[PDB]
Amino acid sequence: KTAHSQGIEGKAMSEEWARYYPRQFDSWKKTKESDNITDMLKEKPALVVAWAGYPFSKDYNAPRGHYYALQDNINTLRTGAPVDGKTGPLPSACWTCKSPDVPRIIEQDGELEYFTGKWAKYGDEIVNTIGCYNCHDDKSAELKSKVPYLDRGLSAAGFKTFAESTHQEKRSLVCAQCHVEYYFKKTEWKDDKGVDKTAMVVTLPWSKGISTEQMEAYYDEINFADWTHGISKTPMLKAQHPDWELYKTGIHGQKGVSCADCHMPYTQEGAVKYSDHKVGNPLDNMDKSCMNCHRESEQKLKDIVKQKFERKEFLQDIAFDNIGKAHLETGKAMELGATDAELKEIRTHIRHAQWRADMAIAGHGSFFHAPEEVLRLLASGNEEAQKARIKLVKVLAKYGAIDYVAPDFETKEKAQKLAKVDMEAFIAEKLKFKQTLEQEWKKQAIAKGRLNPESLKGVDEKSSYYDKTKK
Amino acid sequence: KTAHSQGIEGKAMSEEWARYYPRQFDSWKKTKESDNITDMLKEKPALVVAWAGYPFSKDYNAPRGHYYALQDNINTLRTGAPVDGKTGPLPSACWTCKSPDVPRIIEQDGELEYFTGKWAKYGDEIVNTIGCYNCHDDKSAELKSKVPYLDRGLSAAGFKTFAESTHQEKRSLVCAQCHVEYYFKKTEWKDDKGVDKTAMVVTLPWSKGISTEQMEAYYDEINFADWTHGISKTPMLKAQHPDWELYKTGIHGQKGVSCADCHMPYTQEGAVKYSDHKVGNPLDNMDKSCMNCHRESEQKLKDIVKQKFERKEFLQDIAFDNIGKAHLETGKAMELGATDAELKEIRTHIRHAQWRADMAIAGHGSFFHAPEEVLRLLASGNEEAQKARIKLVKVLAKYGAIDYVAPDFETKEKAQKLAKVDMEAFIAEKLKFKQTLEQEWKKQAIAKGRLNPESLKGVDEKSSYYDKTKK
Ligand code: HEC
Ligand code: HEC
Ligand code: HEC
Ligand code: HEC
Ligand code: HEC
Ligand code: HEC
Ligand code: HEC
Ligand code: HEC
Ligand code: HEC
Ligand code: HEC
Ligand SMILES: [Ca+2]
Ligand SMILES: [Ca+2]
Ligand SMILES: [Y+2]
Ligand SMILES: [Y+2]
Ligand SMILES: [Y+2]
Ligand SMILES: [Y+2]
Numbered sequence: 002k003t004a005h006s007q008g009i010e011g012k013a014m015s016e017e018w019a020r021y022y023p024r025q026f027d028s029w030k031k032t033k034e035s036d037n038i039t040d041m042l043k044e045k046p047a048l049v050v051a052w053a054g055y056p057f058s059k060d061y062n063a064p065r066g067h068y069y070a071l072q073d074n075i076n077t078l079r080t081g082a083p084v085d086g087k088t089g090p091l092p093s094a095c096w097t098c099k100s101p102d103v104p105r106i107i108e109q110d111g112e113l114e115y116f117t118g119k120w121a122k123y124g125d126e127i128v129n130t131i132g133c134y135n136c137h138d139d140k141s142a143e144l145k146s147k148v149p150y151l152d153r154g155l156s157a158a159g160f161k162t163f164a165e166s167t168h169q170e171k172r173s174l175v176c177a178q179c180h181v182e183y184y185f186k187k188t189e190w191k192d193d194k195g196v197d198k199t200a201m202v203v204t205l206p207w208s209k210g211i212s213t214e215q216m217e218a219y220y221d222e223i224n225f226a227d228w229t230h231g232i233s234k235t236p237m238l239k240a241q242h243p244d245w246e247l248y249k250t251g252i253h254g255q256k257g258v259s260c261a262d263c264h265m266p267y268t269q270e271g272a273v274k275y276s277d278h279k280v281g282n283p284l285d286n287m288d289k290s291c292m293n294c295h296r297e298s299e300q301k302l303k304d305i306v307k308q309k310f311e312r313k314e315f316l317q318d319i320a321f322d323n324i325g326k327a328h329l330e331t332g333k334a335m336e337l338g339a340t341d342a343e344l345k346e347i348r349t350h351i352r353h354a355q356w357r358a359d360m361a362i363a364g365h366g367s368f369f370h371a372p373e374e375v376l377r378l379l380a381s382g383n384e385e386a387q388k389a390r391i392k393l394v395k396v397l398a399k400y401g402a403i404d405y406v407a408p409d410f411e412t413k414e415k416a417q418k419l420a421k422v423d424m425e426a427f428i429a430e431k432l433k434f435k436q437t438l439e440q441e442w443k444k445q446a447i448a449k450g451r452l453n454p455e456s457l458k459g460v461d462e463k464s465s466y467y468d469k470t471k472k
Numbered sequence: 473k474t475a476h477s478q479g480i481e482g483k484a485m486s487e488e489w490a491r492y493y494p495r496q497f498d499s500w501k502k503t504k505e506s507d508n509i510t511d512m513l514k515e516k517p518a519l520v521v522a523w524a525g526y527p528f529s530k531d532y533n534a535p536r537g538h539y540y541a542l543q544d545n546i547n548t549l550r551t552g553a554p555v556d557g558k559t560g561p562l563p564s565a566c567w568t569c570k571s572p573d574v575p576r577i578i579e580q581d582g583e584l585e586y587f588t589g590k591w592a593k594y595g596d597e598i599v600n601t602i603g604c605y606n607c608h609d610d611k612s613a614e615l616k617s618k619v620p621y622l623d624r625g626l627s628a629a630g631f632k633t634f635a636e637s638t639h640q641e642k643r644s645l646v647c648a649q650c651h652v653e654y655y656f657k658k659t660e661w662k663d664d665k666g667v668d669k670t671a672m673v674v675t676l677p678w679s680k681g682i683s684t685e686q687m688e689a690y691y692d693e694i695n696f697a698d699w700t701h702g703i704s705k706t707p708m709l710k711a712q713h714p715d716w717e718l719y720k721t722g723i724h725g726q727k728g729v730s731c732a733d734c735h736m737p738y739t740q741e742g743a744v745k746y747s748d749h750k751v752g753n754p755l756d757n758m759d760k761s762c763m764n765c766h767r768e769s770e771q772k773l774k775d776i777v778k779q780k781f782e783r784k785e786f787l788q789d790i791a792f793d794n795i796g797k798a799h800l801e802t803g804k805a806m807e808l809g810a811t812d813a814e815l816k817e818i819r820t821h822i823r824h825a826q827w828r829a830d831m832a833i834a835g836h837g838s839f840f841h842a843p844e845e846v847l848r849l850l851a852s853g854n855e856e857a858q859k860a861r862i863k864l865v866k867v868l869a870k871y872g873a874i875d876y877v878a879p880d881f882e883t884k885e886k887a888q889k890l891a892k893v894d895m896e897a898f899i900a901e902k903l904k905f906k907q908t909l910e911q912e913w914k915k916q917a918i919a920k921g922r923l924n925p926e927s928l929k930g931v932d933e934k935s936s937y938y939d940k941t942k943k
């Protein structure tokens with residue numbers, strides 16, 4: 002048994018586990034070191050055109066340390082600027098994979114109630130970032146999945162549930178609670194007091210399997226769309242960090258190497274043996290993350306990984322350039338009078354092209370986890386995009402614009418202009434929110450004893466729109 | 473020293489080495505077991521359209537056992553039907569990588585003289601198939617490169633020559649004498665007797681490096697073209713088995729694993745240790761070819777290799793379908809009056825699209841040797857093809873054929889019709905050649921003591937146009 006077999010008071014605050022596990026706590030807090038903010042819209046402006054009409058066209062950055070998960074969720078322009086617990090653009094489900102307070106609230110008020118309402122609803126309750134309680138039982142300290150949608154997805158796909166999986170499988174599944182692709186399923190229900198409510202439930206699109214094509218069939222079957230494209234009016238699908246799905250069928254995944262083997266390698270200091278909890282870039286310490294299984298040179302392995310990234314970049318830029326042009330050319334055809342019937346096939350191609358390309362790039366480590374599937378997906382997506390463009394030439398020609406040249410979107414500024422994103426307004430409104438309601442959330446959370454000031458150190462120094470220099 | 477330190481009389485006939493190396497000779501002759509003839513034009517008819525106007529549109533089969541190299545060189549419709557030593561469509565260089573008689577003749581008459589004249593020139597001299605003398609010194613038995621163009625290519629690319637390479641590197645370079653991409657360089661010269669002659673010299677396009685793009689730049693720089701496309705009139709480049717080039721930068725190649733490690737694995741019978749000379753499919757005996765370095769399941773490894781082949785197939789069919797359509801659409805534009813100036817950019821795209829796609833598929837093991845580069849190449853080639861097709865829509869529209877639908881080529885028969893290949897005539901003419909001049913070549917070679925009847929056992933049972941049932 003553990004030294005806390007009856008549980009841990011205040012379990013949602015990771016600091017509460019420190020007295021029992023100083024090593025794991027100290028390494029866990031070190032993800033604070035990964036504070037870089039890479040603005041993906043700035044690096045890949047084609048993404049702005051791809052996501053026109055959707056929140057990702059406003060703000061989208063690369064992943065950084067777990068230490069910043071909650072604050073980034075608050076800072077992203079995607080969550081907008083609520084003025085109370087009933088306003089703001091996004092639902093409560095947006096907190097789900099950012100805090101140990103989520104399982105706390107779910108175990109308290111239930112899954113449906115948790116998924117009901119606005120993101121702003123839990124502003125002064127969900128205040129701790131990815132912690133011990135997201136992956137560990139507070140009595141046995143054993144690995145556990147705290148989100149019901151994971152098992153439901155696993156079962157639907159023909160996989161064993163978390164409880165029925167091997168220990169090695171669990172070392173990856175704890176990550177899969179969050180590092181997977183999902184969608185929100187509008188779910189109607191009624192609470193104990195007889196009140197009819199509507200929940201937006203996190204759902205893994207795995208009922209037909211976890212391949213990109215199977216998920217595609219899943220979404221098409223239910224005629225689902227995350228949004229109607231702002232330029233092409235195509236019914237779009239948004240892929241979000243399908244890290245586990247892509248990893249699962251990559252060679253390491255097929256071999257049984259777990260996320261933890263590379264990202265949380267075992268370490269030994271003296272006679273002390275434990276798992277490095279500083280989840281980050283495995284290449285930072287290859288002797289612990291790679292050289293236990295590989296006998297070659299570290300530099301050679303790093304050069305190989307770099308090559309994989311370069312291949313992905315090559316195909317990514319091609320696919321999204323054609324996807325972007327397709328969206329714009331469809332928008333031009335629309336302006337000229339093209340009917341929905343004339344654009345149906347084209348829009349279907351675009352929907353599929355971007356779903357495949359986004360699934361390939363949304364998982365930031367996929368270029369390494371599953372290189373070959375990533376390249377195949379980008380090639381497949383590009384082909385669908387070009388099929389759409391070949392057809393668009395004919396539609397444009399019919400309306401007298403065969404020589405139309407889709408506008409360029411090589412800078413974030415130009416792309417957001419094409420996507421009609423009023424950044425100045427969004428940023429101004431966001432800053433107001435941060436200076437008022439956000440501070441009230443934190444003040445109240447601290448007053449109630451749900452949040453310890455210590456955890457906020459250097460947590461709000463950067464975002465894609467401001468930089469106090471370094472988080 | 474060896475038991476034949478002064479050399480081997482009749483060294484070009486591998487049977488002559490049997491008295492010294494029975495083990496290697498016995499395994500070497502077993503490639504006779506790999507007699508399957510896979511008609512690639514039948515399996516992938518899109519290749520016929522791709523090679524319209526070129527010999528490969530007539531006959532192109534997958535590689536089989538070394539035992540059949542010489543006979544297949546004779547049987548392929550590509551070498552046609554000469555009536556004497558001064559006729560036939562192809563040059564003497566076509567024997568180069570098919571027989572140990574090649575180095576014999578080169579060391580005798582010199583490289584330029586060997587590369588001068590028709591393929592038919594050496595019909596009764598080059599009669600032994602890939603043998604000991606192609607890779608071994610007949611005095612020391614040490615590995616050697618017998619073709620001067622390999623070192624010239626290696627040096628041009630910044631690589632060490634064969635003599636300066638490590639033993640492990642030589643275990644791959646002996647294969648590279650033949651398993652590489654090349655082109656024929658028209659070379660003018662004058663013999664000792666003062667006669668001006670023209671040679672077609674095998675040349676490795678490596679002066680800018682061995683990557684597909686570098687070779688592409690090499691060919692474009694010298695404005696080279698293997699042939700003018702029969703349908704699109706595009707200046708085409710033909711890629712031929714760039715096995716080593718693609719392997720070199722694949723992970724096994726980067727790690728230093730040699731061709732021999734997988735294709736000629738070390739074997740031990742009792743106290744006897746030797747290299748398995750039955751060059752074939754490593755998957756036939758993974759315990760010798762893979763399991764010495766891999767600790768997983770053989771079935772799992774095989775399933776992974778199968779997956780790689782499926783990914784390659786997926787992209788290959790897409791790329792060649794668009795390449796085929798591009799050729800046909802260009803031919804249609806030509807029929808309508810499109811000028812060379814109007815088609816220049818399109819033809820450049822087609823040339824590059826097919827060069828990249830052909831480089832990706834011409835090496836039959838590349839899907840495994842360098843999976844990621846193969847997928848990237850097929851994706852790149854397809855993109856160039858689609859760029860050509862988008863432009864072709866506009867050219868076709870200008871001439872009133874915007875709704876033109878390129879004809880289908882899903883069967884070898886339909887494709888060869890589009891490529892205007894008179895198979896009946898070619899096969900009839902070939903059979904006549906085989907029944908007359910070929911038999912005379914063999915009868916004379918046997919009479920002169922250059923060929924032993926033993927080596928012909930079951931060697932001429934199959935081809936892509938006849939099957940006595942099984943070679
Ligand atoms: C949900 C509760 C999560 C669990 C469980 C795990 N991760 Fe995570 N991860 C999550 C978020 C929201 C983020 C973004 C943080 C931000 O503010 O940007 C991440 C980020 C990572 C990263 C990036 C690290 C870096 O760039 O420095 C990695 C490498 C990563 N996550 C891996 C990972 C692994 C291996 C997990 C299981 C052991 C794991 N995460 C669990 C959310 C959640
Ligand atoms: C779990 C199933 C998740 C849900 C539901 C949402 N997010 Fe998430 N988010 C998750 C992970 C594993 C990651 C890291 C890996 C990656 O590819 O990003 C993230 C990251 C973020 C970030 C930081 C990166 C960025 O996009 O700027 C933000 C700002 C973020 N997530 C916001 C967010 C919102 C608003 C959500 C509701 C729509 C949401 N996430 C849901 C996992 C999960
Ligand atoms: C999920 C993303 C995790 C978070 C957040 C934390 N831990 Fe963890 N922990 C995780 C894994 C995958 C593992 C390895 C499990 C295995 O047996 O292979 C661990 C392990 C531990 C252990 C056991 C001893 C060890 O291997 O180090 C302890 C005691 C532990 N973790 C404690 C702990 C604490 C205190 C955390 C919060 C600060 C914490 N973990 C977060 C995954 C995750
Ligand atoms: C070792 C063989 C690994 C396994 C198994 C997994 N990951 Fe990984 N991951 C690894 C590398 C070398 C890299 C590239 C360098 C980097 O840190 O980016 C990655 C990357 C990621 C990322 C992207 C992080 C970022 O761009 O900021 C994420 C989010 C990530 N890995 C998550 C992750 C998960 C959840 C895994 C199991 C499903 C997983 N990785 C396995 C190496 C290895
Ligand atoms: C052991 C548990 C492993 C860890 C930790 C890492 N890798 Fe690995 N890797 C492992 C296996 C079993 C395999 C498959 C080959 C085999 O022996 O069966 C691999 C393969 C690779 C490859 C080749 C795959 C490819 O390039 O497409 C690379 C380049 C590779 N591994 C890199 C790598 C790096 C950088 C790691 C640390 C972050 C790493 N591996 C960890 C087993 C294990
Ligand atoms: C030129 C003299 C060659 C040398 C040296 C090597 N190979 Fe070869 N190989 C060559 C030809 C002309 C052919 C085609 C034979 C035919 O009649 O179709 C081949 C074929 C192979 C194959 C196919 C085996 C099969 O399908 O059963 C393989 C696997 C192959 N060659 C590999 C290979 C290796 C590893 C070499 C070096 C040790 C090697 N070849 C040398 C011509 C020549
Ligand atoms: C070495 C540099 C070569 C030259 C010059 C030529 N060939 Fe070849 N050939 C070579 C190899 C390594 C292979 C096997 C691998 C592969 O991808 O095929 C081959 C194979 C053939 C075959 C059998 C397969 C087929 O195409 O049907 C034939 C019939 C063949 N080669 C004919 C041939 C001709 C006519 C040449 C002159 C233009 C020629 N080869 C040159 C290596 C080399
Ligand atoms: C090139 C394609 C080869 C042909 C044709 C033949 N051999 Fe070979 N042989 C080759 C390699 C790559 C190797 C391994 C070299 C190393 O040291 O790693 C060998 C080796 C031999 C040896 C040495 C002992 C052994 O490893 O088995 C002998 C005595 C030998 N080869 C003999 C031999 C004979 C008699 C051949 C014709 C029948 C023959 N080899 C063809 C490559 C090639
Ligand atoms: C092991 C890691 C290998 C190395 C190193 C090389 N090859 Fe290979 N090759 C290997 C496999 C598993 C396969 C696929 C199965 C098959 O036999 O086709 C191949 C295939 C080839 C082929 C294609 C043969 C055919 O389709 O008939 C050729 C011509 C071939 N390999 C040649 C070859 C050469 C010359 C190498 C070094 C440059 C080489 N291979 C390395 C496994 C391995
Ligand atoms: C040792 C000399 C090897 C032989 C023989 C074969 N492989 Fe290999 N393989 C080896 C290394 C060093 C690596 C790179 C990973 C690492 O540990 O550094 C690999 C990798 C693979 C992979 C992963 C690459 C990928 O999938 O993209 C596969 C699938 C693989 N090897 C398969 C394989 C097969 C089928 C072999 C026999 C024909 C084979 N390998 C031989 C080392 C060696
Ligand atoms: Ca989604
Ligand atoms: Ca060539
Ligand atoms: Y406490
Ligand atoms: Y990062
Ligand atoms: Y130890
Ligand atoms: Y003799």
Ligand SMILES: [Y+2]
Pocket residue numbers: 506534535536537
């Ligand atoms: Y074969």
Ligand SMILES: [Y+2]
Pocket residue numbers: 740
């Ligand atoms: Y042994």
Ligand SMILES: [Y+2]
Pocket residue numbers: 372373843844
């Ligand atoms: Y790979």
